[PDB]
Amino acid sequence: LEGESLNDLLALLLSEILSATNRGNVIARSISSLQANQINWNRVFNLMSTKYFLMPTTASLSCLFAALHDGPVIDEFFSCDWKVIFKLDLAIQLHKWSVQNGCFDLLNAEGTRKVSETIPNTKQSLLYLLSIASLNLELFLQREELSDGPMLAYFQECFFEDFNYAPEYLILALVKEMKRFVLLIENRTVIDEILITLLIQVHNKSPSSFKDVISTITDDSKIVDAAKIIINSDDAPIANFLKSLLDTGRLDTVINKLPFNEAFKILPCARQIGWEGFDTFLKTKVSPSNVDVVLESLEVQTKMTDTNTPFRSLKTFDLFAFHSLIEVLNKCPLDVLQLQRFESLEFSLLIAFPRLINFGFGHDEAILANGDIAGINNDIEKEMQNYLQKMYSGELAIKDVIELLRRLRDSDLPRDQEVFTCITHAVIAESTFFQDYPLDALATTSVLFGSMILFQLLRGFVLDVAFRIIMRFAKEPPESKMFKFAVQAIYAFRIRLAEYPQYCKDLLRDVPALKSQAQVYQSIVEAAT
Amino acid sequence: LEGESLNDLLALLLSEILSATNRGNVIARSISSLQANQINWNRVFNLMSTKYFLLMPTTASLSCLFAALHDGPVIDEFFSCDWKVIFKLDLAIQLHKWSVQNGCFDLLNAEGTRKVSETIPNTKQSLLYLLSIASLNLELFLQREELSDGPMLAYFQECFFEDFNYAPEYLILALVKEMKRFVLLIENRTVIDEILITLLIQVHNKSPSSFKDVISTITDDSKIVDAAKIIINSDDAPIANFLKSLLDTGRLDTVINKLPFNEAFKILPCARQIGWEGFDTFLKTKVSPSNVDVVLESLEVQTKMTDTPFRSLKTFDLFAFHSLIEVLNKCPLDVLQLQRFESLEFSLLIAFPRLINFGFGHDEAILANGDIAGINNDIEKEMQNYLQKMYSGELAIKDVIELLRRLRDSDLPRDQEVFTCITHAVIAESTFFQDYPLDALATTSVLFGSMILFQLLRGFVLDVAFRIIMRFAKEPPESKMFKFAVQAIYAFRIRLAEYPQYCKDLLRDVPALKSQAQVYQSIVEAAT
Ligand SMILES: [Au+]
Ligand SMILES: [Au+]
Ligand SMILES: [Au+]
Ligand SMILES: [Au+]
Ligand SMILES: [Au+]
Ligand SMILES: [Au+]
Ligand SMILES: [Au+]
Ligand SMILES: [Au+]
Ligand SMILES: [Au+]
Ligand SMILES: [Au+]
Ligand SMILES: [Au+]
Ligand SMILES: [Au+]
Ligand SMILES: [Au+]
Ligand SMILES: [Au+]
Ligand SMILES: [Au+]
Ligand SMILES: [Au+]
Ligand SMILES: [Au+]
Ligand SMILES: [Au+]
Ligand SMILES: [Au+]
Ligand SMILES: [Au+]
Ligand SMILES: [Au+]
Ligand SMILES: [Au+]
Ligand SMILES: [Au+]
Ligand SMILES: [Au+]
Ligand SMILES: [Au+]
Ligand SMILES: [Au+]
Ligand SMILES: [Au+]
Ligand SMILES: [Au+]
């Protein structure tokens, strides 16, 4: 039997849906006896649709698929336009599929369309089959336009399960078939929103697929929308995610297109990952309208300790970044409170990340060879300590230490540059305690500090720190350890006072008590030039 | 001139204590030319203090008096003499303003002065290194309240606060060394104790490198413990060196046991990491149902911690965790405490996967992979591909089970690691079974069950597995979790007989089992 007469195996399949066992299987086996490509199945299926009957279960469908047997035929069965109730039923019954109880093995039917031609089906999900994935998406996107039965809700539990088990397949299908779904719903932003939920969800469950999903998406509006949510939602670490954006070349776009201050949050980990659009980011993005964000961030990074915070390498800038940030920050037009906060921060920053001190004079390779924020080894701390106390015990002259530091500041040997860092840092951090010092130790420290300013061992921002400290002590009551320290330090660098007339005018303005310190006062007023 | 009439250089020294530039250190140079040991100086100073003032010397004049005396023993002799209080006060105050660079007598280089230690060097270049001066200050300050309040007392007090910040190690060394004398002076144990504890805490904050040394000299552990109780609560972490200092001086075990509980528990991981050695006995002795909410809380927190910093110091090693589980299931837990604890065994094995096969005689192997470190990527990847092969047809479940059974008893670290990884992966994946397609779910169900059957899951981990299977079994029939419980239970049915209590529970609490004929049969068969 052939042709349109033959096409009434439509009836065979139709009853093989209708409720049978004994004869059902010989029916499927008999239809399978056919050469499928020489049958016009469109006719058969549309025939089933048109003249309706004379709800399938997994057993029945299983025999329908056994009858059809060929992946292209099965796909054809799916693409036929069924009553929504039947499609809902079909999807629901496939969610209950098991080969182990003897259902037809669809996953092994050759020539079905896949949600991906690259990604293998590791999840072992029927949603790998594009027909099925798209069935589910098609039903789900239409949720509201459908009758609410028991089956609607049941399907919703099914899809929620699918959404948890294999969202990568759901999203690969949503993209591969996107024209269709946009045209079906006739609302692009519903497709967009569902797309973003999916993307976020592929990140949460099964991140090993994320890159692969990202690959197939063009509009980066979506990826940014998703990244924005992933950022605030997740507690850290997000590294793999950022590395997947980098590896697919979407990361820079996300950092720049993300709202500011979410971007800034993730800037340190982006760098450890290899991002390297940072200085451009600073130049373009950093404005006086957002600076308070930057200050908040850096303050926080200084308060972090390797034992207070989970990662900190990925939460803290490297020396190069901190450096760049300091430069730009003293360049931006900060208001008064913002500048007080910033200067405060430069001190907190120098205390927190001491390798910053000598950074940016062209010895950086040597500096960085000791680590960025890692913290100084105990033997260098101990050596620096021995050196210093030996100065305080009279054995070494101040100018000896000064000579040493002056050698080390220009050294390319990492341990050198490190010892420099430790010594200078030590003095500066120790500045909070000068007011408790006996007068001899205080005088020695005062001359050491001052000479550090004289011989140019403190430069850049570190020198402004120094100057602000000296100023801050100068503003303390005279005859006080702090005031005596200010005075002696200033005297100790006096030969170079000529280079900072502004500073001298500020000392003269704001420290009247200087009028009682003869030699120094004279030196400072001579800085009217 | 000799004798008592010589002892009337009381007059000379007395004049130097009064304010010219020229004459003063001529007098000084003259007096110093004498041989110091031959003079009876006690008599001299006594005379100086009795027919006396013809009060409040200048720093220049004091420097002159020291230049006159020159000798450490003589100088000490000058300090010990009992002078008026206003003089003692002016004396401490002028010493606080000492400068050798401004030309003051160099007191620190005088030979044969009494120090605060004969061991510790004067690294701080403090006059408080000299026991006479340290003690002078302690003496004045301990008497704050009972002394007339002038401007001198206030001045001095501010000096002492500077000393308190600069060199507390010297003040406390001196307080202990002369402890008898100060006890006699105050006659209040609580004042000496308050000051001692305060000093000790202060040595910890500034100059911690001195702490161990200070701690050596103290016999009473009561104060060390008090101080440590303050230090623990006040500081945010880390305390490592501090505890190490207590261990090296043998006060650590004492402090852990004499500290209030729950502070003590907080510092237990770091203590062990340092080498403490008393954890066993601590658990056995101190853990009571009134304090277990603290143990539970601390353990939960440890589970939720992510590498909450570098956590090595905040987190127990595997041996401690194991011990804690053992002890906790032996304690009379409340209902809520029970829920919590079991939930905790799960969260625990999720967070510390090397716990799984721990304590069966393979621990060295396990521990060679790290304690809490986290499984290497090569292992996760290998393990993943392996398991996958099982889920798509290639490997039979009994193959995986055979392998695991092999690795369970292995002393090779990596075998034990792979085991940890596969088993942990299945269990951690348990939260997601309700999303599994039926075939994958069935395979996992049989794998899990067989894990129970062939004794891959033992001890507390077995109790976890059973609690999971049970919890899934209470879910409505035809639901995925229920089908999972059923298939798992079925897959170990042969060993059901080994667990009558479990079977009876299954029979009482899960009526729906009566609908799976095979399994129901086996369970009542195993009900004895
Ligand atoms: Au035929
Ligand atoms: Au046939
Ligand atoms: Au079939
Ligand atoms: Au079936
Ligand atoms: Au959804
Ligand atoms: Au990822
Ligand atoms: Au798109
Ligand atoms: Au982060
Ligand atoms: Au990172
Ligand atoms: Au700009
Ligand atoms: Au602003
Ligand atoms: Au020099
Ligand atoms: Au330092
Ligand atoms: Au500052
Ligand atoms: Au003289
Ligand atoms: Au003579
Ligand atoms: Au004099
Ligand atoms: Au003097
Ligand atoms: Au005090
Ligand atoms: Au004592
Ligand atoms: Au701690
Ligand atoms: Au210490
Ligand atoms: Au520790
Ligand atoms: Au208990
Ligand atoms: Au009890
Ligand atoms: Au963990
Ligand atoms: Au694993
Ligand atoms: Au099942």
From Swiss-Prot, chain B:
Is Repressor found in the keyword set? yes
> Which superkingdom, per the lineage?
Eukaryota
Keyword set, alphabetical order: Activator, Coiled coil, Cytoplasm, Nucleus, Phosphoprotein, Repressor, Transcription, Transcription regulation
Transmembrane segments annotated in the record for this chain:
none
Task: Please provide the Gene Ontology terms (biological process) for this protein.
Answer: negative regulation of cytoplasmic mRNA processing body assembly; negative regulation of translation; nuclear-transcribed mRNA catabolic process, deadenylation-dependent decay; nuclear-transcribed mRNA poly(A) tail shortening; positive regulation of transcription elongation by RNA polymerase II; pseudohyphal growth; regulation of cell cycle; regulation of transcription by RNA polymerase II
The entry's cellular-component GO terms read: CCR4-NOT core complex; cytoplasm; nucleus; P-body
Q: What else is known?
A: Present with 4300 molecules/cell in log phase SD medium.
The job of this chain, per UniProt, is described as:
Acts as a component of the CCR4-NOT core complex, which in the nucleus seems to be a general transcription factor, and in the cytoplasm the major mRNA deadenylase involved in mRNA turnover. The NOT protein subcomplex negatively regulates the basal and activated transcription of many genes. Preferentially affects TC-type TATA element-dependent transcription. Could directly or indirectly inhibit component(s) of the general transcription machinery.
The record describes its quaternary structure and partners as: Forms a NOT protein complex that comprises NOT1, NOT2, NOT3, NOT4 and NOT5. Subunit of the 1.0 MDa CCR4-NOT core complex that contains CCR4, CAF1, NOT1, NOT2, NOT3, NOT4, NOT5, CAF40 and CAF130. In the complex interacts with CCR4, POP2, NOT2, NOT4 and NOT5. The core complex probably is part of a less characterized 1.9 MDa CCR4-NOT complex.
**Family, per entry:** Belongs to the CNOT1 family.
Identify this protein by name.
General negative regulator of transcription subunit 1
> Span within the entire protein?
192 to 746 of 2108
